[PDB]
């Protein structure tokens, strides 16, 4: 029974995986796009 | 000095305001032709008393 809850959690611990990435911007200003994309949500 | 968006605007303005100017050669011509004349003819007398 512990086996599953090593299974469940460390499978569920995958589900909420949150990683960050830097996307460059060749034309638009990053400060605009940061206001626009944050006005949606 | 501006953000990446405003810059790309101000580069297309400066590119279009940087054009080569033409120069002009302005001649004036001031002409004047004058022609005068006059004529004067008359007799006069005098005498004693």
Swiss-Prot record, chain B:
Subcellular location, record wording: Cell outer membrane
Record note on disruption phenotype: Severely disrupts assembly and function of T2SS-beta.
Domain notes from UniProt: The N0 region interacts in the periplasm with GspC. The S domain interacts with pilotin AspS2. The N0, N1, N2 and N3 domains are periplasmic, while the secretin and S domains form a channel that is partially inserted in the outer membrane. The cap gate extends out on the extracellular side of the channel partially closing the channel. The secretin domain forms a double beta-barrel structure; the outer barrel has an outer diameter of about 110 Angstroms while the inner barrel forms the central gate with a small pore in the closed state.
Subunit structure: Forms a cylindrical channel with 15 subunits, each of which interacts with the surrounding pilotin AspS2 proteins (also called GspS-beta). Interacts with inner cell membrane protein GspC2 in the periplasm. Forms multimers in the outer membrane. The isolated N0 domain forms dimers that self-assemble into rings.
Family recorded in the similarity comment: Belongs to the bacterial secretin family. GSP D subfamily.
Additional remarks: Encoded in a type II secretion system (T2SS-beta); this strain encodes 2 T2SS but only this one (beta) is expressed under standard laboratory conditions.
Function in brief: Part of a type II secretion system (T2SS, formerly general secretion pathway, GSP) for the export of folded proteins across the outer membrane. This subunit forms the outer membrane channel.
Protein name: Secretin GspD 2
